[PDB]
Design a protein around this motif. Structure first.
Motif, PDB file in Angstrom:
ATOM      1  N   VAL B   2      32.679  41.048  31.741  1.00 29.48           N
ATOM      2  CA  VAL B   2      33.062  41.620  33.023  1.00 29.48           C
ATOM      3  C   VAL B   2      34.530  41.319  33.333  1.00 29.48           C
ATOM      4  N   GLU B   3      35.014  40.170  32.866  1.00 31.11           N
ATOM      5  CA  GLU B   3      36.389  39.774  33.137  1.00 31.11           C
ATOM      6  C   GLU B   3      37.377  40.604  32.329  1.00 31.11           C
ATOM      7  N   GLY B   6      36.897  44.338  32.999  1.00 36.35           N
ATOM      8  CA  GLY B   6      37.334  44.583  34.358  1.00 36.35           C
ATOM      9  C   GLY B   6      38.847  44.594  34.445  1.00 36.35           C
ATOM     10  N   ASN B   7      39.480  43.719  33.668  1.00 35.14           N
ATOM     11  CA  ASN B   7      40.934  43.641  33.651  1.00 35.14           C
ATOM     12  C   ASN B   7      41.563  44.880  33.030  1.00 35.14           C
TER      13      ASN B   7
END
Lengths: 49, 49
Positions: B2-3, B6-7
């Motif tokens: 997700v990190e 997401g980035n």
């Protein structure tokens, strides 16, 4: 005396082994919830960035 | 997951979000340029005529 010393040694060694194993599992667990909060922080950081 | 995703998603989304703006601005400027060429070539046309 060498016999009783060997007994106490093996026993204390096994106990320290089981203990360090417990504390190790607790470490992995704490790393897990820390991973959770870190994940949420990654989410907020993602939206912010 | 997700990190990182997401980035990269926020980054590329920022890219497209800008590109649509310079795109629409390119449209309006294309319109002003159209009027400019219009009246210019029109007034110049009287001269060549």
């Amino acid at each position: 005396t060498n016999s009783q010393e060997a007994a106490a040694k093996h026993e204390a060694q096994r106990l320290e082994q089981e203990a360090r194993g417990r504390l190790e599992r607790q470490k992995i667990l704490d790393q897990s919830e820390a991973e959770k909060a870190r994940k949420e922080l990654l989410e907020l950081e993602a939206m912010s960035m | 997951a997700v990190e990182s995703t997401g980035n990269a998603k926020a980054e590329a989304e920022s890219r497209a979000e800008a590109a649509r703006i310079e795109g629409e601005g390119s449209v309006l400027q294309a319109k002003l340029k159209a009027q400019a060429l219009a009246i210019e070539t029109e007034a110049e046309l009287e001269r060549v005529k």
